Amino acid sequence: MTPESVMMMGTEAMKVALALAAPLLLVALITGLIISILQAATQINEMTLSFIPKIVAVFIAIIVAGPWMLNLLLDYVRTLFSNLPYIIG
Amino acid sequence: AIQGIEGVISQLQATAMAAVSFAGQLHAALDRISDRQAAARVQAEKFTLGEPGIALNDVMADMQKASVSMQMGIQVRNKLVAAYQEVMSMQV
Amino acid sequence: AIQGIEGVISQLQATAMAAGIALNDVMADMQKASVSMQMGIQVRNKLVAAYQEVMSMQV
Amino acid sequence: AIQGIEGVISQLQATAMAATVSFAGQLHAALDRISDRQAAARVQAEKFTLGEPGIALNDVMADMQKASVSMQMGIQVRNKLVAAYQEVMSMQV
Amino acid sequence: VTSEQWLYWLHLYFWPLLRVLALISTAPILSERAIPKRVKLGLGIMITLVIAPSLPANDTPLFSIAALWLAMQQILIGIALGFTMQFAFAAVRTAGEFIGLQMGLSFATFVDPGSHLNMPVLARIMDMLAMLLFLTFNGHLWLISLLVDTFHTLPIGSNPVNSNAFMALARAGGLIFLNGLMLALPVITLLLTLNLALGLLNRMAPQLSIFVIGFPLTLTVGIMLMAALMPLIAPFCEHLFSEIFNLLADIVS
Amino acid sequence: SWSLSVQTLVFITSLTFLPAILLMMTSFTRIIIVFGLLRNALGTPSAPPNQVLLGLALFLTFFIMSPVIDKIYVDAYQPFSEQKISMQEALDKGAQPLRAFMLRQTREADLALFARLANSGPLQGPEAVPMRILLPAYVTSELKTAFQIGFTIFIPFLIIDLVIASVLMALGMMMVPPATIALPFKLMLFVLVDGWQLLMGSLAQSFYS
Amino acid sequence: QSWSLSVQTLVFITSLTFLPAILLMMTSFTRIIIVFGLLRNALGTPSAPPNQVLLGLALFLTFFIMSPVIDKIYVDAYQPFSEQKISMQEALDKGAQPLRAFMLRQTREADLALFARLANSGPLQGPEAVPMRILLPAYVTSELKTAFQIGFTIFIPFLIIDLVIASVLMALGMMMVPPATIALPFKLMLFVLVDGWQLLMGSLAQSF
Amino acid sequence: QSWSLSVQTLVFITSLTFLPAILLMMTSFTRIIIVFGLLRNALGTPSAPPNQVLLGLALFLTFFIMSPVIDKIYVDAYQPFSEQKISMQEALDKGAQPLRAFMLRQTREADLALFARLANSGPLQGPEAVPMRILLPAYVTSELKTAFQIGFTIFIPFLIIDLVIASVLMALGMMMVPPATIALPFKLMLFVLVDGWQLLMGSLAQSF
Amino acid sequence: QSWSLSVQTLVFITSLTFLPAILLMMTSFTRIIIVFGLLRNALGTPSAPPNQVLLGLALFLTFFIMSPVIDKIYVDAYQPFSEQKISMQEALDKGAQPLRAFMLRQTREADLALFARLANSGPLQGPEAVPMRILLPAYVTSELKTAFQIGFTIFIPFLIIDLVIASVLMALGMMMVPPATIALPFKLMLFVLVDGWQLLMGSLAQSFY
Amino acid sequence: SWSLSVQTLVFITSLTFLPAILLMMTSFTRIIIVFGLLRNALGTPSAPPNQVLLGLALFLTFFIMSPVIDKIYVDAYQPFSEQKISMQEALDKGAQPLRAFMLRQTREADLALFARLANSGPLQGPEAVPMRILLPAYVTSELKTAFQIGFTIFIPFLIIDLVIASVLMALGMMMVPPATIALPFKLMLFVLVDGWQLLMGSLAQSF
Amino acid sequence: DRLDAALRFQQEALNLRAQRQEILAANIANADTPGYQARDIDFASELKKVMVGVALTLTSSHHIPAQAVVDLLYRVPDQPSLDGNTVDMDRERTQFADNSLKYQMGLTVLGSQLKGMMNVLQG
Amino acid sequence: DRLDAALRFQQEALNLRAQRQEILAANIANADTPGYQARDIDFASELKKVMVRGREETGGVALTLTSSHHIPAQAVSSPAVDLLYRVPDQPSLDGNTVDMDRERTQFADNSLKYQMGLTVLGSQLKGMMNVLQG
């Protein structure tokens, strides 16, 4: 009820969002950086060949860590809906 | 209640320091109409009973007046309901 | 009122410059009031509809 | 029934242990009240037409009119309830 | 007897109802479409039932242009109050949308302005957070109280009116931007530095950067930055509400 | 007491205001607003054909208001039907349990505000509050509680869209709409975490707590 | 004992008011209509087939699915009542049985358990002890959940097509094109080459 | 056997109530309307032809397409009824036959089989005895499938134009130039040059 | 032969409902608003003038265009109706002829031939004997085609501006600059300096002649 | 003076065209188009809500019509009570300030075009322009004025965008999009100069 | 039922008037019977008695419900007849006319009450 | 104001009809009282008088009731109409001029004219609700 509680639940929510999005974004960033440094080393420059492995890497990311995200988000939503009638004002 | 009497004395102190409604009016009108109807009915039953002094003229006239008052109440209720329905249709 | 008499003299200056209850009454006032209330409701509905049409715009 | 007697003994055990409004139940009770009033008036008219002694014409007419008033009560309550339900269900969330 | 003068009651209960309902249809949270219309109408009716008997009743007939002027006055007062209150949520939405646009969340607006493809999800997040905060600080009760109070300042009866006062509400349009920047100034600045940092990376070997490494990094950084910045809005939320409220109090009079 | 004609007239007239009682004096209001907000949240503004939500809300309200209705029946309707309490006293007797429910859930700040707006005297205890003060205070408290519940409901369904948009943007697919991708995932979430049992139980507790 | 004919007429004509409510809450109309709305959303176009066509088609599908229950009701309740062999109330009680079985067969256990908890029910016992006022909301909740389960997996192939087209377009280089615009004709192609309507009706009917 | 006059006019007014449903689910209105909506979406102009204009065009096209069926109903069914030669029941039965034949001509055997198997109908010898309750949903489903086929096929030339302009812009290095702004005028030019409106209406009429 | 007063009133009030249909399918309105719907797209601002402003401007332009037809209908048909020298049936027969001529002059022969063939009509001796059932949809089709022609032609100078701005941006190495936002103010410049609105309305009015 | 019931019918009917009066007769279109173009300028098509822009335009319209409203009050509102003039003649007298305003804000070319569209040859004087010719001409003039003001607003933001892109290109960056960098600078320029109040002052001066 | 309580008094008065009418007509018809005593009822006391019972309990369907199943005062003779008949023509003719009038009045009052209860409901 | 003024003529005519019928009923009641001159009013002149100057009463004086326990009482409140004497037809020894044929003809005529006023006023009020009906 108190504004501290409101800001705490908002912060925890958006940290949950950060945890959900961090693996995919980080994998894409690492793949892009690796392809870019390889291009710099080989002196190859086409703006389209960096887009190819990024999709494959990010799609594999759901294969490997997808169940973890799905279990984390469901637990968050379940706990939020269960604690809903105790943060009422 | 003991606390209720405490509240009464508190409101009396409030009056000392300081020195009906539409629903009330409708309740008063309903009570008046019902009282008139009950008076006419009681006089009619007294006449049917055979008790002296009650004239058929007065019985019949009072029944007439009670019927007119009932019809007035019915019309007021009809309009009031119509106005309430009109207001509840107002767009907000 | 003192201010009321002030208003009377003001209107005079303005003129200078310019130069029990029966069913019959109960029912008639009851009907008017119903008519006036219906008129108010309709006018407000028109105003609200115009306002919502303006605000439902797309800029 | 054997299971019916089982249910009777179960309700007796319920009474032992003991020692809830229903809108549908209330509507059923009101409809019953109206229907038995109408049936009583109808049977009284039946007996008076058949010629059975003890039945009076004024009582027959009064009971018929009472049944009519009861049915008008029911019809008006039906109208109000249906109008209220339709206005509630015509609302948008 | 049995008078029940209807015109007196109608004129006593009408104009306060008009003003209360005009505020209701525009005031935030009380004007959200999720509330059924009958609930709003009943709330206005009950508030008027509580308030009107204390006020002096007006006698202008409903069948006169004076009644039209009165109705216009009540509508103007109600919509002005509700809109001045809504300005704060407009400012919060602006700040959120700008943080989200610097996230690169909706890049299609820079190439196709207004092309039916826009999702200011951060703007919605902070808009609903602001609504929750407004509910917590009981702003709506205050709104109702001020709607009642504007009578003593401005009675139902037709009263003369002023001018630059309207400008004030229109000039409040500046606050939405000004205060909006005040909510976005820290985080965007660091994001700016991040973009500057990305520029330094592009000053190295040409291409092979931006649109491939910049977007995920800046998205994650914006996410965690403003997740940490969430505790900051509440003092700014109270500041915004106080600004709107005292501007309303000063200018309505 | 009133004549039987007057009693019948009053009964028929009072039968009219049933939607008003359901909307302004009952749990129905904060049993709907939440449903409308949740429907706005999932991205399907039609989905449960309204009527469905209205029927579910009616059944929920009937299950929730059961003790209040029982108390009214045992204290007011039963003596009135047995000719022990007059028609003009059954209403007063039955308005008290509803008033108490209306209090158990109505916040204070609202009570203080509407006690000040009526220019009424000090209310030292809750037993001095009339219905003219409790009605709009209860209405405002119910509106605020419903909006709080809905606005904490809204958060996960926007979180999913946020993460979907960020993931789409990592790979450079800037022209893919995020809402179309997020809607199936929002439906999947609301399926997984017992979307309705948890919400139903949370609302019911929100009343009985 | 039997009701008077006037009472029977009053009850019969009053009960027709709950016909839309019966069709929506108690029959298969809700699930079919929710699935149809979700499928339009999934097709990429929000209002391609008018609401009228979908509503009529859902009504026909509901009638075809419920025809066995209607036949059972007619055999048990309507026919012996119309021949003046049973009373109205007993006819209604007898006819509520096949509809109760149909509602139970598609009811989630958790929904029934929760709504029995909220109705203070204690020793329930046989599946043939659940009252109508408890069974109905549980059936509605189960129908909503099942419709959502069907919709979110109906969404899958169109998301696959959208993602594949967007990935191919952006990897090829044309990142400024809107993928949905190019994807919509392919969604229609997939729907017509699979016989999406016929297979969807088959699946919806088989779901019972 | 002939219905009394009051019953006849009750039936007539009740049937007139169901007019939009008959237009949507028994005539060619639905397919034309779906194709028109898909075409409007295909040009990149979501609101260029107002809905009322397209609805009127579809209504007129439907009237022209169904003129032979209406003529058959008039000559075979309505005319004897208006001259009191035949009763209303037999007139309706005779008028059903041309409309069914038309609907059977434009239905798919697979959908008819699906609805027959779903409704547990007994074996039916030939197209002569197929109930309307079976034929109507099958015809609606077939119309939906055919409309989607036509729309998906129509979507092709605009896709060609979009792809060629996007490729031309991309091969010039113009990385941040969106192709929709350049493609829309050329889509309009393509549709104008091929006499698109009359050609598409003629194609829709010829398919019936 | 004249209809009764009740039947005349019924027919008049019934035909009053077809006013939007008559306006769209029989008057100039269809060609105007559609062009506006495209012009706001060419300028790069889908918001543009508000929808209602454009609709009312189209309505006024339509009235100005049909002023001769309206005057001819008023003189030939409605004036004897008001002065009692004609019936309602004969007035309906006579007043449509100028409007039929107006529709025919803007009707492409190919569409008219298509709808004849599709109605299986007999040999029409001359324009004067063309049925309204054949003239209406053909007029609507030709109207749509003409509106699309005008819109595509309108789309030209803004395409010129976009191409020039994009070429200038790319020739300087400023490849990462979206040219739409830069070229929008120059499109507004072009529409302002040349007096785009007045020129466009004059062109439309002259096109109908 | 004609019947009271007919007066009520006409009044409620004329109440319907209130959006038409606001859009076609007042200046509301000009402010709304200026706000839309300004929003398009900053690069954020949803930063202030459409509702807020509409309400701000409404308040600006009310102020800028306040002199015309006062003239209407003097010529129509007051004498309708003293009954020196009333009914349709008083309505026309009250509408006269609206003409004067719309004559002031209308260009001559639009009026000339709409006159030759109505074959009104003997329209010689400039205070007897009929409403049918005055209204659409006024709307077109408002559209032209709003587009001109929008371009004038566009100029500084376009300059800022061009400057940011040029410095990015000169500094060596060839891939960084200049819109992301230039957006906060656009906002800080808009706030620092207090763009909003000067914009409203100029709009009020623009009449 | 509350509806019975409102209409109980007038129904009982009407029934008592009909019974007394039958008794008076029986007195008129038996005027010539030698040894016949003229009988009558005291209307007010009997009306009190009627205005101021236990249906047997039915446990099931087959159980049969309970089956249902005034005091006459002699008139004081005025003239002594020889055959023992005490019926006086004038007295009972006046009483008969009065009872007819009161029966009509009771019908009027009961009809008015029912009509009022009806117009309350009509709408 | 406008609606009040538009409906004022028929309302006042109907009130004057009611008062005239009260007077005629008083004449009929006193038809057998010896020494009672029949009274009647000139409807047109009194109607114009009431329109130009508002309705007024001769008495109306009543006890004021400031408290809620004061006993309410009123003296007499008759209209400000001029009660004129009707010219007798034929003489009578008792000395009253109430001729029953004249009384019953005026009663029936006033009855029909009051019903006419009710019809006109009801038609006008519907003629207005029709407009306020959208």
Numbering used by the authors:
A (entry chain As): 1 to 89
B (entry chain A5): 3 to 21, 32 to 104
C (entry chain Az): 3 to 21, 65 to 104
D (entry chain A4): 3 to 21, 31 to 104
E (entry chain At): 4 to 256
F (entry chain Ay): 37 to 245
G (entry chain Ax), H (entry chain Aw): 36 to 243
I (entry chain Av): 36 to 244
Question: What's the paper's own text on this?
Answer:
The bacterial flagellar motor is a huge bidirectional rotary nanomachine that drives rotation of the flagellum for bacterial motility. The cytoplasmic C ring of the flagellar motor functions as the switch complex for the rotational direction switching from counterclockwise to clockwise. The basal body is made up of the LP ring, MS ring, C ring, rod and export apparatus.
Given the high fragility of the C ring, we examined several reagents as the media of density gradient centrifugation in the purification of the intact C ring-containing basal body–hook complex in the default CCW state from our previously constructed ΔfliCD strain of S. Typhimurium, which lacks the flagellar filament, thus avoiding effects of the filaments on purification of the motor. We found that Percoll, a low-viscosity density gradient medium for use in separating cells, subcellular organelles and viruses, could well protect the structure of the C ring and maintain the integrity of the motor during purification. Local refinements of the LP ring, MS ring, rod, hook and export apparatus generated their high-quality cryo-EM density maps at the resolutions ranging from 3.0 Å to 4.3 Å. In the intact C ring-containing basal body–hook complexes, the MS ring is more stable and harbors much more clear densities for the outer RBM1 subring, outer RBM2 subring and putative inner RBM1 subring, which are made up of 11 RBM1, 11 RBM2 and 23 RBM1 domains of FliF, respectively.
